[PDB]
Scaffold this active site. Structure first.
Site, short mmCIF file in Angstrom:
data_model
loop_
_atom_site.label_atom_id
_atom_site.label_comp_id
_atom_site.label_asym_id
_atom_site.label_seq_id
_atom_site.Cartn_x
_atom_site.Cartn_y
_atom_site.Cartn_z
N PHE F 41 -2.59 -1.00 -13.66
CA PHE F 41 -2.20 -1.04 -12.28
C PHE F 41 -3.43 -0.77 -11.47
CE2 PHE F 41 0.88 1.11 -14.80
CZ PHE F 41 1.71 0.05 -14.96
N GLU H 57 -2.23 5.58 -15.41
CA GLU H 57 -3.00 4.37 -15.60
C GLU H 57 -3.45 3.68 -14.37
OE1 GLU H 57 -3.50 3.99 -18.58
OE2 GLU H 57 -4.71 2.11 -18.71
N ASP H 58 -4.50 4.15 -13.72
CA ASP H 58 -5.11 3.38 -12.62
C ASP H 58 -4.24 3.25 -11.40
OD1 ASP H 58 -7.89 2.23 -13.46
OD2 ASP H 58 -6.56 1.69 -15.22
N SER H 59 -3.38 4.24 -11.15
CA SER H 59 -2.71 4.35 -9.87
C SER H 59 -2.97 5.76 -9.31
CB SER H 59 -1.23 4.13 -9.96
OG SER H 59 -0.74 4.99 -10.92
N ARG H 241 -14.33 6.49 -19.89
CA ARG H 241 -15.11 5.89 -18.79
C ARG H 241 -16.24 6.80 -18.37
NH1 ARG H 241 -10.26 3.83 -14.95
NH2 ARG H 241 -9.67 1.82 -15.92
#
Ligand SMILES: [Mg+2]
Ligand SMILES: [Mg+2]
Ligand SMILES: [Zn+2]
Ligand SMILES: [Zn+2]
Ligand SMILES: [Zn+2]
Ligand SMILES: [Zn+2]
Ligand SMILES: [Zn+2]
Lengths: 275, 46, 49, 98, 49, 455, 67, 392, 117, 51, 73
Positions: F41, H57-59, H241
């Site tokens: 996302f 996850e990336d929010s 990362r």
């Protein structure tokens, strides 16, 4: 019920802005729910409709409308007798559910003019003015003390609008926050182990943690339960601090007693025989 | 009815309200900028 | 007269180079704007090295 | 009109025939922030084949040190082919050797 | 240090980067020459050496 | 609806979902379906297509509906398991030092769907009731599936510790009759593993009950995590003075050892290694020393980590990241390389003008002495930026080539199919196999097994 | 473009403290002391003012506030 | 803010922030960019904490009351431009009020918003149902002898109306004549985009991510003053990362916001940055590596792990969700092949190419496969001769 | 504009009841209350008052989704006392503590503090 | 063989911990735009009449 | 079928036939009325050259030539 303790209060400190207190012998869920009311449920007045007559300023209109809603408003004397907009029989607005503001400024002078909270006038009686500069024998008064620079204007720009302030509460928009902030703390020496410190020497001691003036740091007790919550409610200025607390508790009482009436409504209407 | 038409820099109405070519009297510019409506709108402070 | 050469913005041959910061603000031009791109038919166009 | 034309479309030269490799050389100057523009004007492009080439003109040669940006290249299909000039770097205008 | 004193004074006194180059303390070096120089990272290393 | 995304790389990229309408404008979807669609996302958008009759709706519900898409016939394992925070939160919850008081247990019981209705007796009766974490996890396991092991966690002493009498060591996970007896759950228990709890559940309970199992594990473990908490700051990135001294000393010894090998090489007496030129012998040797140097300090940093390092907690559940990352952040980054070799001589016999001509030392040719935490020195940064390109470029190429290899392959085989006499034949009706896969079994129903008679 | 009424993180009104601040810096080179006198205790309220850039001042300078 | 004088610029498309801030932690190189003069983001109070999983996850969980108080709000301008082309021999375009009695057009959208000159005036609110400019194209003229007159005979319509920015207000309208000498206009529309679920944000270390949910001040977790975070980013974004720099920046930032002087972050020095910063932050009065005791908003209990919180400059990006959504029931059909449109800008339909086909094959859902590739894009009936297969 | 109007977060709809009671199908003397348009503030506190009572066997609440304003409260009591009466007492007792808290706070303010108005 | 289809939609995905494994939240506007043809039977007729 | 100019409404002669571009449909207000084989005007439709290289336009199956100056292409 016999197992209700009925708490206890102590006011440590009071100012025109802060109110700092301790609640003791109660439940955390009570403390946390009451902290949440101080934010969301306490009602207040803030600008809610802005009608722009003329706007030649270098700020776009919706920007003026935004800055302008967000400015604080005294409400203490009048926030109670005022009714909610949707509930009020009137079409659109009326004197009984809203209060009107008017702003008119033009830069005819060669020096840049500022547009401020004092330049905003209540068509409504001066019972509910803007926060700054009124009956202010105020040591908080410094330089301009405009409370807010709504915009700046160079020679030629002008600004004319109308605004209607309305009663509402913080759950619906942040402009209705009656607090500058709300400190909340319980069990300062970490007796109850609700947090688990890795190398406890690396942490400082708050002003409430002095009880262990020593450096022994956190004596354990497993038979304990959370007690004695510390608060420091701080006024945005639009509603004085004690009034925030008393209105919060009453609103919470009103919300609870209403849920009791609907639960009664279940036993009266559609007789409670389902379970 | 007039269609105003404030012009650039001169800060005066162009006044043109017909099919004639756009050019502000007195002022040498030929860019226009149709004026704000008198019709009321509304903005919520939300 | 033989033709029209596109000038590049704020170069030594585009009038903006001579004016001062107050003058440039007077011409509705940004003082910080870097120049060095051509203007064609309304669109600002930059040549890639 | 000839300079007007070439510079606008981004083509190059004769149009009727010459436009096979030296295409895309002018571009509309991106203006999304202040940085996109400074970065755009200070961009440089290596020409290349297109659609499938894998070799060494894509990796970061040592001689770019002090010359072209270490990390600053399109995250897309043309990775390492369109480069951006470092912060201090400069370019010669050139003159007669006489 | 005298060159630095001129750069601070540059805030009102006439001076330029071009003056700094004319002093011959700074040079321009292209990638082909850069192959043959012996370039050192910091005054620190060049002194401590 | 059928939900899809591009690039659709295999049959599990497009699966049936039931819609549920909500406020705001993005498709909101379950976190666990993230790995089958390869979604993130971080701005990846996905595509939906709606069926227009009962006939296609029937066909979708039975064939392509998601819960049926759990165990992929590519390699008879789960296509989807418990991922990210929940996976880290499960490890942390199952440690047997975790205790719950009546109030929190009831709330977790409350978030669970298929709860029995009976409240379990707390593993500790006195002085005050407490339920252990394993105990509440054990309500989440459907019916009564069974599996030993299926952990292979870092824990213990591989190859000889379990034989060291089984001081239960708690590491190894054992579940019996639908109750978790001991151990800690991780990616090897819960993930896309061949023998994970999730794989066994699909088989034993049936796909519908397994879906309730995924939902259950997540709402309940997740809810706990909320009170417990998780994080990572600079406190999860530093070690003590003594380890820090040991790292520098290990590196200082190894650098002197490289200078020592360079001194031997210039003397002309090194004696080359078989099938190699003397530079290769030399290059193979320095490369062995620098790698050994990274691994020695890498093994030192993993030891030096405290129990509470959140960074170690993410690595161990297997949620995200790994041992090498700990090596790079805490210890020393190591030799960079490009095309499988140390940084080439770009200029005449040199990597950068900052060095001497012909300088085979570690640093001068692309060894990074620093950790990400101390920061890289300028040359190391540029040799690190060089190591950064090889991966970005590799990414752009592989995407084009594999897209082409896959299309060509499907295009051949498409018309092959198993006929009703169960011989596999193509379009012109030629026989491919007499029985599919030489036994006529399905690929999603097979399992790894041990043959007793090879004893 | 002019300092916002009320700090984002919490709510404490902050536009009123801008004009006061430019006066204090002119008087003293004590950014620490300046922020303190204004009453901006916690740093969210402090970043607000400390990190603001008043673009409005350059913006007003164009002659044509008339279009 | 991308240049100072934007207000007198009819840039075809632009985005500006209400409140930009320069960054707390800055590089010296930034002085020469003038990135102080025109910054691109806000100093967020961030917590790197796990919480309720709406940030997995990336929010990110972003603070709703902060977006109420104008956090990252922006304005959006689209300038539409239209030309009055003379267009040769016997036709003409005209700026005027289109009526269904006098022109060939009659598109369903409402013409009433227009002024009597064919072009709206600033301040009137518009939407995807509105026409901004009334252009008409006189064409045939009268080239259809004998009283094929009736009505709407003189001219076709082709006036321009909002597809995209399907709501907003008109900012500015400008009438002029361009280089051909034709009457030309640019009309500008202003919209205000509030940061919502689906807007993409990114901090400075290359970690972009979408806003996964927003909680109101009441619900965020809090501490001391209760300085509730304006964002909660997931811990898992860091480890694989190794964006450690991101983690130092909060820490440098904490000292800079508190001490009151903008912090240094230039890449190469001997400022022993990890230790020296940790020692300063503790002298002021915090855990020296930045952790704070947080409480949860739902029940007020403490959160057992201490959570790393402090400021970080963040970016709101040009990728915003309401422009990106899309859908189609039945639409425009291109009579090259008469299957649905590809110009999404003009209500397109998404593709279902060979690979998506290949998966339906791999499922073995043949009926759904014929449906997507036939009845639901392009069905047709033809008669063929039984003797010979020509459709003639 | 696919965002909901903000008032809807708290304003009751004319076609929905404030509270609903449904019986459990599994175990006796359990009950399920649905509270509409009311979040953790009311829910968390009613959960605690029920846990305070000594005859409650089980008490809990769940807000099914963030985006949907609604909470459920499940309660289970001994085979003698009804769950409805426990709920009635739980609020009434809560009303009593809060009233006493408001009284005690106000009198505490009545202390010779000189900035009360 | 690669056709553009009708009844298609595309938006961003964001995570949602409350969905079941096979549920998907769909924006209300997209849900209003895209339709399904139910055929009227003498059972749902009263329900469809309401719609 | 030659009798049209937009008319085919079964129950009553046509008065108006509005074009609902977004639905791809032709509507007849005073009843219910779709009748449509929709074309939003083939000139917008073929215009599916976009994200692909548009500066050169490989899709241009139709040159302008500018006939209204001339007559015979
Ligand atoms: Mg991805
Ligand atoms: Mg992922
Ligand atoms: Zn009224
Ligand atoms: Zn004029
Ligand atoms: Zn604040
Ligand atoms: Zn025939
Ligand atoms: Zn009709």
């Amino acid at each position: 019920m016999p197992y209700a303790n009925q708490p206890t209060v102590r006011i440590t400190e009071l100012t025109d802005e802060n109110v700092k207190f301790i609640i003791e012998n109660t439940d955390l869920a009570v403390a946390n729910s009451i902290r949440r009311v101080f934010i969301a449920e306490v009602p207040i007045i803030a600008i809610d409709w802005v009608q722009i007559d003329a706007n030649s300023s270098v700020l776009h209109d919706e920007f003026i409308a935004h800055r302008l809603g967000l400015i604080p408003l005294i409400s203490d004397d009048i926030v109670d007798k005022l009714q909610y907009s949707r509930d009020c029989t009137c079409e659109e607005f009326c004197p009984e559910c809203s209060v009107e503001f008017t702003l008119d400024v033009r830069c005819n002078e060669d020096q840049t003019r500022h547009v401020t909270s004092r330049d905003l006038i209540s068509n409504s009686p001066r019972v509910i003015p803007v926060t700054s500069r009124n009956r202010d024998n105020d040591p908080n008064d410094y330089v301009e003390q405009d409370d807010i620079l709504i915009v700046k204007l160079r020679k030629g720009q002008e600004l004319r609008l109308r605004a209607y302030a309305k009663k509402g509460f913080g759950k619906e928009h942040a402009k209705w926050n009656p607090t500058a902030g709300v400190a909340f703390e319980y069990d300062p020496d970490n007796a109850l182990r609700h947090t688990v410190y890795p190398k406890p020497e690396e942490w400082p001691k708050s002003e409430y943690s002095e009880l262990d003036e020593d450096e022994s740091q956190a004596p354990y007790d497993p038979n304990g339960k959370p007690e004695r919550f510390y608060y420091n409610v701080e006024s945005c200025g639009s509603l004085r601090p004690e009034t925030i607390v008393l209105s919060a508790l009453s609103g919470l009482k009103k919300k609870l007693s209403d849920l009791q009436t609907q639960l009664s409504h279940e036993i009266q209407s559609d007789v409670l025989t389902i379970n | 009815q007039p269609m105003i038409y404030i012009c650039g820099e001169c800060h005066t109405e162009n006044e043109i309200k017909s099919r004639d070519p756009i050019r502000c009297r007195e002022c040498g510019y030929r860019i226009m900028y149709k004026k704000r409506t008198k019709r009321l709108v509304v903005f919520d402070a939300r | 007269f033989i033709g029209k050469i596109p000038i590049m913005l704020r170069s030594t041959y585009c009038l903006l180079n001579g004016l001062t910061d107050r003058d440039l603000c007077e011409l509705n031009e940004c003082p910080l704007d870097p120049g060095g791109y051509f203007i064609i038919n309304g669109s600002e166009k930059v040549l890639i090295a | 009109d000839g300079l007007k034309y070439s510079l606008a479309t981004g083509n190059w030269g004769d149009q009727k025939k010459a436009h096979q490799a030296r295409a895309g050389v002018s571009q509309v100057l991106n203006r999304l922030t202040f940085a996109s523009t400074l970065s755009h004007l200070r961009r440089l492009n290596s020409p290349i084949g297109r659609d499938g080439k894998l070799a060494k003109p894509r990796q970061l040669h040592n001689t770019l040190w002090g010359m072209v940006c270490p990390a600053e290249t399109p995250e897309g299909h043309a990775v390492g082919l369109v480069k951006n000039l470092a912060l201090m770097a400069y370019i010669s205008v050139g003159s007669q050797p006489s | 240090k005298r060159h630095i004193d001129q750069l601070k004074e540059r805030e009102y006194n006439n001076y330029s980067w071009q003056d700094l180059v004319a002093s011959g303390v700074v040079e321009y070096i292209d990638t082909l020459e850069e192959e043959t120089v012996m370039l050192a990272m910091t005054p620190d290393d060049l002194q401590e050496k | 609806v059928i939900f899809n995304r591009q690039p659709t790389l295999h049959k599990m990229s497009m699966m049936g979902h039931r819609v549920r309408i909500l406020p705001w404008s993005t498709f909101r979807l379950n976190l666990s379906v993230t790995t089958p669609y390869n979604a993130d996302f971080d701005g990846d958008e996905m595509n939906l297509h709606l069926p227009q009759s009962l006939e296609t709706r029937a066909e979708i519900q039975e064939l392509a509906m998601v819960p049926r898409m759990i165990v992929t016939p590519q390699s008879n394992r789960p296509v989807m398991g418990i991922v990210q925070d929940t996976l880290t939160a499960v490890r942390k919850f199952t440690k047997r030092d975790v205790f719950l008081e009546r109030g929190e247990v009831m709330n977790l019981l409350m978030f669970l769907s298929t709860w029995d209705g009976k409240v379990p007796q707390p593993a500790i009766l006195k002085p005050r009731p407490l339920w252990t974490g394993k105990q509440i996890f054990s309500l989440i396991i459907p019916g009564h599936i069974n599996c030993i092991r299926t952990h292979s966690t870092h824990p213990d002493d591989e190859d000889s510790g379990p034989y060291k009498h089984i001081s239960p060591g708690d590491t190894k996970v054992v579940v019996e009759n639908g109750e978790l007896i001991m151990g800690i759950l991780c990616k090897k228990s819960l993930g896309t593993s061949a023998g994970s709890l999730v794989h066994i559940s699909y088989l034993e309970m049936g796909h519908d009950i397994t879906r309730l199992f995924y939902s259950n594990i997540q709402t309940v473990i997740n809810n706990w995590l909320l009170i417990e908490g998780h994080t990572i700051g600079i406190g999860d990135s530093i070690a003590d003075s003594k380890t820090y001294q040991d790292i520098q000393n290990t590196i200082k010894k190894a650098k002197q050892d490289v200078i020592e090998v360079i001194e031997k090489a210039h003397n002309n007496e090194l004696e080359p290694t078989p099938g190699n030129t003397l530079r290769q012998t030399f290059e193979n040797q320095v490369n062995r020393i620098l790698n050994d140097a990274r691994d020695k300090t890498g093994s030192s940093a993993q030891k030096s980590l405290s129990e509470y390092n959140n960074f170690k907690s993410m690595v161990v559940s297997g949620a995200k990241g790994s041992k090498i990352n700990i090596s790079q952040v805490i210890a020393v980054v190591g030799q960079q390389n490009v095309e499988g070799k140390r940084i080439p001589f770009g200029f005449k016999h040199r990597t950068l003008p900052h060095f001497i001509k012909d300088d085979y030392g570690p640093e001068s040719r692309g060894f990074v002495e620093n950790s990400y935490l101390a920061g890289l020195t300028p040359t190391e940064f540029f040799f690190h930026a060089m190591g950064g390109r090889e991966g970005l470029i590799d990414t752009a190429v592989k995407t084009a080539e594999t897209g082409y290899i896959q299309r060509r392959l499907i295009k051949s085989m498409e018309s092959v199919m198993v006929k009703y006499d169960a011989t596999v034949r193509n379009s012109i009706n030629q026989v491919v196999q007499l029985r599919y896969g030489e036994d006529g079994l399905a690929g999603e129903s097979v399992e790894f097994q041990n043959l007793a008679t090879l004893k | 473009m002019i300092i916002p009424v009320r700090c984002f993180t919490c709510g404490k009104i902050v536009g009123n403290k801008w004009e006061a601040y430019l006066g204090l810096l002119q008087a003293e080179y004590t950014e620490g002391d300046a922020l303190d006198a204004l009453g901006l205790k916690r740093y969210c309220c402090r970043r607000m003012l400390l990190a603001h850039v008043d673009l409005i001042e350059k913006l007003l300078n164009y002659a044509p506030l008339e279009k | 803010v991308y240049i100072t004088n934007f207000h007198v610029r009819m840039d075809t498309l632009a985005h500006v922030l209400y409140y930009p801030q320069k960054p707390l932690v800055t590089t010296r190189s930034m002085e020469y960019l003038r990135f102080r003069e025109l910054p691109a983001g806000i100093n967020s109070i961030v917590a790197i904490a796990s919480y309720t999983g709406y940030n997995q996850e990336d929010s990110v969980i972003m603070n709703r009351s902060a977006v109420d108080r104008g956090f990252f709000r922006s304005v959006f301008y689209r300038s539409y431009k239209e030309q009055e082309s003379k267009k040769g021999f016997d036709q003409e375009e005209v700026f005027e009020k289109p009526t269904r009695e006098t022109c060939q057009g009659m598109r369903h959208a409402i013409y009433d918003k227009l002024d009597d000159d064919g072009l709206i005036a600033p301040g009137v609110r518009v939407s995807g149902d509105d026409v901004i400019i009334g252009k008409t194209v006189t064409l045939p003229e009268n080239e259809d002898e004998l009283e094929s007159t009736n009505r709407r005979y003189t001219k076709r319509d082709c006036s321009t109306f909002l597809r995209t920015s399907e709501t907003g207000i008109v900012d500015q309208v400008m009438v002029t004549l361009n280089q051909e000498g034709y009457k030309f206009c640019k009309i500008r529309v202003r919209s205000v985009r509030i940061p919502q679920i689906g807007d993409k944000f990114a901090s400075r270390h290359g970690q972009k991510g979408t806003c996964g949910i927003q909680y109101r001040q009441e619900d965020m977790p809090f501490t001391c003053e209760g300085i509730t975070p304006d964002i909660i980013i997931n811990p898992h974004a860091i480890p694989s990362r190794m964006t450690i720099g991101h983690l130092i920046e909060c820490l440098q930032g904490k000292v800079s916001a508190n001490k009151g002087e903008i912090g240094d972050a230039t890449p190469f020095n001997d400022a022993v940055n990890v230790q020296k910063i940790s020692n300063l932050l503790s002298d002021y009065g915090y855990h020296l590596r930045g952790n704070e005791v947080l409480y949860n908003g739902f029940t007020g209990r403490k959160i057992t792990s201490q959570i790393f919180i402090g400021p970080t400059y963040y970016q709101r990006l040009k990728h915003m969700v309401d422009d990106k959504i899309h859908s189609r029931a039945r639409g425009p059909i291109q009579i090259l092949n008469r299957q649905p449109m590809e110009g999404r800008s003009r209500d397109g339909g998404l593709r279902f190419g060979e690979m998506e086909r290949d998966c339906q094959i791999a499922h073995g859902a043949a009926q759904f496969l014929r449906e997507r590739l036939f009845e639901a894009s392009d069905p047709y009936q033809v008669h063929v001769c039984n003797l010979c297969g020509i459709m003639a | 504009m696919n965002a909901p109007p903000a008032f809807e977060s708290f304003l009751l709809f004319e076609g929905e009841k404030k509270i609903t009671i449904n019986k459990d199908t599994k175990v006796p003397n359990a009950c399920l209350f649905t509270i509409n348009k009311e979040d953790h503030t009311l829910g968390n506190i009613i959960k605690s008052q029920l846990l305070k009572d000594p005859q409650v066997l089980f008490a809990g609440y769940k807000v099914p989704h963030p985006l949907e304003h609604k909470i459920i409260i499940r309660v289970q009591t001994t085979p003698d006392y009804s769950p409805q009466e426990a709920f009635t007492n739980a609020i009434t007792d809560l009303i009593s503590e809060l009233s006493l808290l408001e009284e005690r706070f106000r009198v505490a303010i009545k202390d010779k503090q000189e900035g009360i108005e | 063989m690669g056709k553009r289809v009708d009844f298609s939609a595309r938006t961003v995905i964001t995570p949602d911990p409350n969905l079941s494994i096979d549920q998907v939240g769909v924006p209300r506007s997209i849900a209003a735009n895209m339709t399904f043809a139910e055929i009227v039977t003498p059972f749902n007729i009263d329900r469809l009449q309401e719609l | 079928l030659d009798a049209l100019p937009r008319v085919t409404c079964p129950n009553h002669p046509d008065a108006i036939l509005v074009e609902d571009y977004r639905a791809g449909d032709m509507i007849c207000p005073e009843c219910g009325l779709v009748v449509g084989d929709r074309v939003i005007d083939v000139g917008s439709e073929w215009r599916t050259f976009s994200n692909d290289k548009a500066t050169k336009d490989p899709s241009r199956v139709g040159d302008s030539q500018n006939p209204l100056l001339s007559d015979g292409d």
